[PDB]
A paper describes a structure:
The N-Myc downstream-regulated gene (NDRG) family is a member of the α/β-hydrolase superfamily and is repressed by Myc expression. Although NDRG3 has a high structural similarity to the α/β-hydrolase family, the substitution of the residues of the enzymatic catalytic triad and narrow folded cavity due to the presence of helix α7 and helix α10 indicate that NDRG3 is a nonenzymatic α/β-hydrolase fold protein. The NDRG3 ΔNC structure includes two domains: A canonical α/β-hydrolase fold domain and a cap-like domain. Compared with NDRG2, the helix α6 region of NDRG3 is a flexible loop.
Among them, a truncated construct (residues 29–320, NDRG3 ΔNC) with an N-terminal hexahistidine tag was successfully crystallized. The NDRG3 ΔNC crystal contains six monomers in an asymmetric unit (ASU), and belongs to space group C2. The cap-like domain (from Ala167 to Arg233) contains a disordered region in six subunits and four helices (α7–α10), which compactly cover the α/β-hydrolase fold by interacting with four loops. The disordered region in the cap-like domain (from Trp173 to Leu182) is sequentially matched to the helix α6 region in NDRG2b. Interestingly, helix α8 of chain D, E, and F were structurally different from that of chain A. In the crystal packing of NDRG3 ΔNC, helix α8 of chain D, E, and F were influenced by adjacent molecules while that of chain A, B, and C were away from adjacent molecules. Therefore, the crystal structure of chain A, B, and C of NDRG3 ΔNC seems to represent the structure of NDRG3 in solution than that of chain D, E, and F. In the crystal structure of NDRG3 ΔNC, the crystal contains six molecules connected by disulfide bonds between Cys30–Cys30 in an ASU, whereas it was grown with monomer fractions in purification. To our surprise, the crystal structure contains two different dimeric interactions: Chain A/D and chain B/F in an ASU. However, the predicted solvation free energy of the dimeric interface between chain B and chain F was −11.5 kcal/mol, which is more stable than that of chain A and chain D (−4.8 kcal/mol). Taken all together, our results indicate that NDRG3 ΔNC forms a dimer, wherein the chain B/F dimer represents dimeric interactions of NDRG3 ΔNC.
Author numbering:
A (entry chain A), B (entry chain E): 29 to 172, 183 to 320
């Protein structure tokens, strides 16, 4: 039913978790997490939600852990060359060849969402569709205390983060303990050094300076209280509106998939129906 | 390549025109023209365009003429029971069944857009997606001189009607000469008899009091200078935004398939790419 693979890439080893069994024609739901998290802390609560098991049983599900972010991972040596964001994206095609995966439907949070975008631009033939949570298609442009507090700021809004409710302290413990703290630095370093996605919205008038844009279907997802609102909004204006949709989720900040899974599952179902998959869903 | 069929239905005879052959589990691009037009005056100028014949090589094209609206159609006898807009939609499964078709990608104009929309709600299993040009989901809301002058004003905006005579004059003659004038008044009457499409936008928490909507991918099209702007915007407001995109074509009159085929074809190509069809550039 399930399996775990330490897949050999040109940029090192990538740890994956396959759930279910895919047929040749149907794509796999490939998953890619955010900084401070892994496939478990990011997605398991969402994917194992009642309404999601109705959807996921029809598909296979391939959960990608970022280098040295998988649970029980050993510490990378001090001066280890940690894969760049673009290089992380180049580690995905080898995963698809190893597991004989013909194509994917991508779900990504933050850093994961960037990587799956780069992957989708790198290979439109492999990506059928994307669900991009808290995506930032822009470079940071900000380089300077506590890596855990830096990542908590990336995820949760100031109002939300200042309050320090059960959710905040829960995910403080996740980021602190679940992930190798030496490797988390390097993964955050890679993400903070991401380049501009170089996407621009096409104009039907004529070719737009050969600006690239996601060919596949794209569902953008952001919480109203999220610090990534302006980033996801900017990403929406730079993507093809005919193949892109913007979901603003109410009374919600960081990690919409964990806080409002019932709403995001319904959004996901509609998204999968539009593509022609899972018609009988009543 | 070419075959025209006079398909026998319960609501009478429907004229269809099949271009190319449909094979290998791919949908036919089924079309439905507007009031005062037929498939020739509505689509042949759009479909014979250089950038459209590149797409239609891989697809099969089924041109549906509305009862009596086809070329050289004999006049319906005085007091003929002309099918309702809901009955016109109930004639489409016979078409799909008669021609051994599994499903369609629908291109509807005005009344044709309403008819394809009703067909999609009745039979979501038979419709993979809809391009709806100048669609109005709401009933006229009231009842009634020169039929040609009415249909011109239906199609064409105020500043457009007197600015570009070349189009208005050519189509004045299409509405007047190329179609049976007895039958035309009946098709017009049927369209003005249309009920509310009874679609509502889904709430991501709420259950709409079990209101229905289009479960397929939909591209709403209308020109900035069309008299059908607010009706198509009103249609957009009542559809699922995750499955629906609105295209307001800048500097575009009543007929974007006639006026701006270059831009609309490009839009339709992106629309088909989102569904997973026609991956590579044409």
């Amino acid at each position: 039913d399930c399996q775990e693979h330490d897949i050999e890439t040109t940029h090192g080893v990538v740890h994956v978790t396959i759930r279910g069994l895919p047929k040749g024609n149907r794509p796999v739901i490939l998953t890619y997490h955010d900084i401070g998290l892994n496939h478990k802390s990011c997605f398991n609560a969402f994917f194992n939600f009642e309404d999601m098991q109705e959807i996921t049983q029809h598909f296979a599900v391939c959960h990608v852990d970022a280098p040295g972010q998988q649970e029980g991972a050993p510490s990378f040596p001090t001066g280890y060359q940690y894969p760049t964001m673009d290089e992380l994206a180049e580690m995905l095609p080898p995963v698809l060849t190893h597991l004989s995966l013909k194509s994917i439907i991508g779900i990504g949070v933050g850093a994961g969402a960037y990587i799956l975008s780069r992957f989708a631009l790198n290979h439109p033939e492999l990506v059928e569709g994307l669900v991009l949570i808290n995506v930032d298609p822009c470079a940071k442009g900000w380089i300077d205390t506590n890596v855990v507090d830096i990542i908590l700021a990336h995820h949760f809004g100031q109002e939300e983060l200042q309050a320090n409710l059960d959710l905040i302290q829960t995910y403080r413990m996740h980021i602190a303990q679940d992930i190798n703290q030496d490797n988390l630095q390097l993964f955050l370093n890679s993400y903070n050094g991401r380049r501009d996605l170089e996407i621009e919205r096409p104009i039907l008038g004529q070719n737009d300076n050969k600006s690239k844009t996601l060919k596949c279907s794209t569902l953008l997802v952001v919480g109203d209280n999220s610090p990534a609102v302006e980033a996801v909004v900017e990403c929406n204006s730079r993507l093809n509106p005919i193949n892109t949709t913007l979901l603003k989720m109410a009374d919600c900040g960081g990690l919409p998939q964990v806080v409002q899974p019932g709403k995001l599952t319904e959004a996901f179902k509609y998204f999968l129906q539009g593509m022609g998959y899972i018609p009988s869903a009543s």
